[PDB]
Structure formats: C-alpha cells, structure tokens
Amino acid sequence: MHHHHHHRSGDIQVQNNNTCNGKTFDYTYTVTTESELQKVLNELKDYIKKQGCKRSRTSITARTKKEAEKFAAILIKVYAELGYNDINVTWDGDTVTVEGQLEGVD
C-alpha cells in the first residue's frame, strides 16, 4: 500500500464535517476498497461518539445511483449505531451526504 494523495478522481473520498467547536475535528479518509470504507467508517463512528457532536454530516463519493445505494446504506448503519433512529439519505449527484432526518415535505 502507498496510495499518494492524487487528484485522479475515482477513489471513495469520505469527508466528515461535524459541529462541536469547528471543522478542526474533520474526519477525511480516501480509500479505493469497500472493506477499507467499512474500516474507516467504523472508526469515524468512534470519533463522533467521543466528541460532543450535536450533529455531523459524512460525505461519501458515489457518482452512480448504484454507489448511492450501497455506500449510503453502510453510512445509515454508522448513524443508526450512534442514534437508533430513522436516518436521512441525501445524494446531490456525485456524493452522498447523510445529516439529520427528512420531515414534512417527503
């Protein structure tokens, strides 16, 4: 394993923006494997738990709708362990950002 920080887009960039004190607590990992994704999310979960995270948004690279299903599902589990509630799945078109829960307008 080397994996130099390249701009060659194709890898799974997991970027967590959490509100606690600031983005100084960011949890950004760049993997190329679903197993490595599961590993870094399980650990990212431990961080959100440790800090006084009122709410956090983890953004996972998912350019196709297929990826917007599979990578998002793993992340809904991560949030469901930190809070055993209904979890929101929001995908813009290139990245799935999971934060809060959708209400009213569904």
XYZ file of C-alpha atoms in Angstrom:
106
model
C 0.000 0.000 0.000
C 1.222 3.534 -0.963
C -1.862 5.495 -2.177
C -0.338 9.006 -2.729
C -2.876 11.907 -2.334
C -3.751 12.341 -6.049
C -6.481 14.439 -7.733
C -7.219 11.460 -10.129
C -10.954 11.170 -9.260
C -12.192 7.554 -8.855
C -11.474 6.784 -5.182
C -14.005 6.923 -2.330
C -13.403 10.277 -0.531
C -15.116 10.121 2.889
C -15.206 13.686 4.399
C -16.935 14.258 7.795
C -17.962 17.843 8.654
C -19.078 17.957 12.335
C -20.191 20.866 14.546
C -18.621 20.658 18.062
C -16.050 23.509 18.113
C -15.185 23.636 14.392
C -14.035 21.679 11.281
C -10.678 21.269 13.149
C -12.292 17.873 14.105
C -12.768 16.858 10.369
C -12.554 13.085 9.535
C -11.440 12.850 5.879
C -10.246 9.457 4.546
C -9.546 8.447 0.906
C -9.951 4.686 0.195
C -10.328 2.569 -3.008
C -11.943 -0.551 -1.418
C -15.380 -1.231 0.244
C -13.644 -3.140 3.102
C -11.380 -0.114 3.758
C -14.562 2.038 3.589
C -16.197 -0.136 6.324
C -12.987 0.163 8.441
C -12.668 3.996 8.234
C -16.464 4.492 8.878
C -16.403 2.158 11.961
C -13.510 4.277 13.319
C -15.161 7.609 12.198
C -18.224 6.466 14.232
C -15.999 6.098 17.355
C -14.826 9.733 16.861
C -18.390 11.227 16.562
C -19.308 9.267 19.746
C -16.201 10.575 21.624
C -16.734 14.286 20.758
C -19.792 16.408 21.700
C -21.157 16.158 18.149
C -24.684 17.678 18.199
C -24.919 16.599 14.551
C -22.399 15.565 11.857
C -22.502 15.047 8.062
C -20.365 12.335 6.429
C -19.940 12.746 2.656
C -19.055 9.513 0.715
C -18.110 9.535 -3.019
C -20.952 7.889 -5.012
C -21.190 9.169 -8.641
C -23.597 6.438 -9.903
C -27.030 5.578 -8.386
C -25.650 2.047 -7.647
C -22.973 3.573 -5.369
C -25.620 5.971 -3.928
C -27.417 2.804 -2.700
C -24.541 0.583 -1.404
C -22.109 3.189 0.147
C -25.026 5.174 1.622
C -26.506 2.013 3.267
C -23.242 1.379 5.223
C -23.321 5.047 6.398
C -27.023 4.852 7.508
C -25.836 1.905 9.741
C -22.974 4.103 11.187
C -25.507 6.828 12.181
C -28.087 4.225 13.377
C -25.489 2.887 15.917
C -24.803 6.467 17.192
C -28.566 7.132 17.321
C -31.100 4.263 16.937
C -33.497 6.411 14.855
C -34.643 6.885 11.243
C -31.641 8.200 9.230
C -31.725 10.576 6.185
C -30.061 9.621 2.855
C -29.361 12.751 0.725
C -27.434 12.419 -2.584
C -26.641 15.539 -4.699
C -25.337 13.678 -7.786
C -21.657 12.814 -7.020
C -21.525 12.429 -3.195
C -23.988 11.082 -0.528
C -24.127 13.455 2.487
C -26.061 11.947 5.454
C -27.258 14.558 8.036
C -30.420 14.848 10.212
C -33.783 13.355 9.101
C -36.302 14.461 6.402
C -39.680 15.742 7.802
C -42.958 17.154 6.377
C -42.074 17.512 2.663
C -41.050 13.922 1.735
